[model samples]
Target: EDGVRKCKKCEGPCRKVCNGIGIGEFKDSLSINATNIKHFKNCTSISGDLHILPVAFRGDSFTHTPPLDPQELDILKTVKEITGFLLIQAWPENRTDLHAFENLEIIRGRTKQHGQFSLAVVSLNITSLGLRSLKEISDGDVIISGNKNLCYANTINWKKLFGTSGQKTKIISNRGENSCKATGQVCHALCSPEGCWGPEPRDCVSCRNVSRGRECVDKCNLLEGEPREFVENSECIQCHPECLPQAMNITCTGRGPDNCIQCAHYIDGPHCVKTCPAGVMGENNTLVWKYADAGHVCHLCHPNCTYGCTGPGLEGCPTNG
Candidate 1:
């Protein structure tokens, strides 16, 4: 391998949406400079080892490439796969982030430099690659070096980048954020294994379980005693206190007395109430309502009994006796 042959002159407009910059003899490894960087926006894949040189700036010798329109860099989001190793050099001062590579996923690593290193990100000014959608680097060690301002780099669970069978990657001369600098910049506890970007709860790549608005949580809470209930979401929810009849175990499917899934010293259908009315003067023995369905419901009591009978039968009434 003769190493990467960079695009020395990236002048002129785009050539359609781009052609092959593939690896091996046919059409191998491409190096992109400022003017040509915009050509990748509509691309889905780059079939070669990619070398994107930083935009030319002050104190640098290379005057061939001019300063870039920062928005032009946003085009990388559509480039998902790079068939070989990808090398990223120092970025311009204000470019402090690599959100541009937001959607780049597979780094095939068919060609490698720096020994086993595949995705070599070195000498950049950034807090995090925020490589939000990166999934795998198939055949090489991912190498990150010379980035001083980086964080969240070490926090990334590397094995997940290539599944359990994946290879080892390294961070050298860079700030790995061992402390994670955690302060307000924290990921939601229940975020997906993929991890997060910034501090906001919404920054989570995905919720490990369910989401409550912007918050990601394992499951909705179900609290017993009193009347706290949660269905599809929770920290936990309190239903109407009246939904809990005296001395009965209570819980709600969602919220409110009407949605109560189970509760009560007395229940009418699924709802909880203090008492069941004695039907009519003589119409009590309809089937004899004493916990007719279960020992939890207050079915109609016998009408002949005073102060509302407990059971339906004439003899079953405490007042009648």
Candidate 2:
């Protein structure tokens, strides 16, 4: 039979006419760059789902075609509600054009047979799931899975975007540093204003330090067997040894005596062990030691030293020292 149909004047809705042939009910759906996108121009409500799928060509070549223009897809902007699911799938690699549905605020299922999922996206190579403006999905689940390249899935505020904190949604198998679960929980715990999730809530508190409004205050209160001291305006608690007084107002910099190995002042040797010899200031004094085979030896100081020295000249000493 010829692939063309010649109709005189008999039709219900345009949807029924389009649904007369082709993939059964999908006649009401719009495929990628399908010319039928024109039929949806003035249609604010679809009796069935809106499907956005990639073109399946006849050959193994499978060359890609240009995606639907965002401007053309803007026809859905006036659509405040969808009676059926909004199914988007099989996108070309690296394509992320779903942002065109920014104006879609609600999805109401066409029939009670499809369960509660009015929106579904599967097996796409999109980097971002851009439905930031969507406000609600009445009696429908929000199923977004198998999007391997989809990050930012956890960053979306589903509660705010969906107009409800608890919705039957499924978000899984996404490739990202922080993926969220459908149970309304993120892969990582919700961080307080001053807290974060480094593996666990406690680990984050240890590194992030304790604050009045922070959750890990008790955990970070005692670290390395020492009570932490609160430094005002600082996010982290100061621990002993690291925060201990070395000399004057200077602290040990970190923890343990060896921490002072890189002392800032004229102090030298392990843990600021010893100062420059009397009258030998700065690099004018040097540490005298020897190799195991060479035996002990006395190193020279700077040219400015009058007594025992550490280096060849005072130039080796710290300028402030």
Candidate 3:
């Protein structure tokens, strides 16, 4: 009666422990003091002093956390525009438990949800989660994973992962290298195939690999567009050149007539387009250019970009008082 009641056919807790025949010995003289069971599941044990919490005995289907919606979408957009990435440090309004981003995804490290949506971008080496909005990524956009610990991006065919119209896929390996391919910080020939593989014969444009320049290799830099042309039927020699000057040469070279210091139309700022070309009037006080699928009309400051963190360091979600 002092122990759990059981049918006469089965030996219960009382018969096993109370009797001297039990072979297992408790380490401490006070065997009854243990409130947590080690391996037993779906069973409850009660002692005079304390009660042990029951363990899960049966396996159950796992429910997944849902992705963020429109309101949450706005917050993520602000975070991405300011930081170029959103770190998912805290749980969303729905997720009660803390599951690593990798836990739910079919891929081990990256979370691709609903077949097309990427819930978060995770850095393999850092174990930090980055939130990527559905709107930010475009068709055929390639995302390369660079962090050390989560280096599986190379193996995944992201085009198939995102489906046909979704972003295309490319891999940039920074495994043994010090530089970052994404920002073009300090990469070498060893970091990229085009940089390392294409250096040989004169016909080796493919063979002529670039180590420090555009082909430095982590993320694939977008290929340059055909030079913009302004052809003249009358006096064509003034502005036209066979191979258009590189963007750097045209913008930064002191040798060029449009050098930042001497040009009648030079304006200095964090970006190059702040100034207009000579004889051209400043229309909107901003530069407009089109790149890839996105058309960028650069502005000094936009009102929507008004909501930014006050401090120099990044801010987390609002905390409770």
lDDT of every model, 2 decimals:
0.59, 0.47, 0.25
Which candidate ranks first by lDDT, i.e. highest? 1
Off by over 4 Å in 2: 1-33, 55-78, 112-116, 160-166, 178-321
Task: Point to the candidate with the largest TM-score.
Answer: 1
Q: Is 2 or 3 the stronger prediction by lDDT?
A: 2
State the lDDT of candidate 3 residue by residue for 151-238, as single tens digits: 2133222433243353544344424333234433221333322222112121111212222122222221112333222222211112
In order of appearance, the predictions have TM-scores of 0.53, 0.40, 0.18
lDDT of 2 by residue, 49-116 (tens): 66666542111133343445545656554454565667776655534535446556567654432565
Once model 2 is optimally superposed onto the true structure by TM-score, how far is the C-alpha of residue 64 displaced, in angstroms? 18
Instruction: Indicate the TM-score of model 1.
Output: 0.53
- Compared with the true structure, what per-residue lDDT tens digits does model 1 show for residues 32-119? 5454565565667767676665532222235355655656667676677776777777565576567678767787777777657678
Deviation (Å) of 303 in candidate 3: 86
In candidate 1, stretches whose alpha carbon ends up further than 4 angstroms from where it belongs are 1-30, 55-64, 163-166, 176-179, 182-186, 192-195, 200-206, 211-321
> Cα deviation in Å at residue 254, candidate 1?
20
lDDT of 2: 0.47
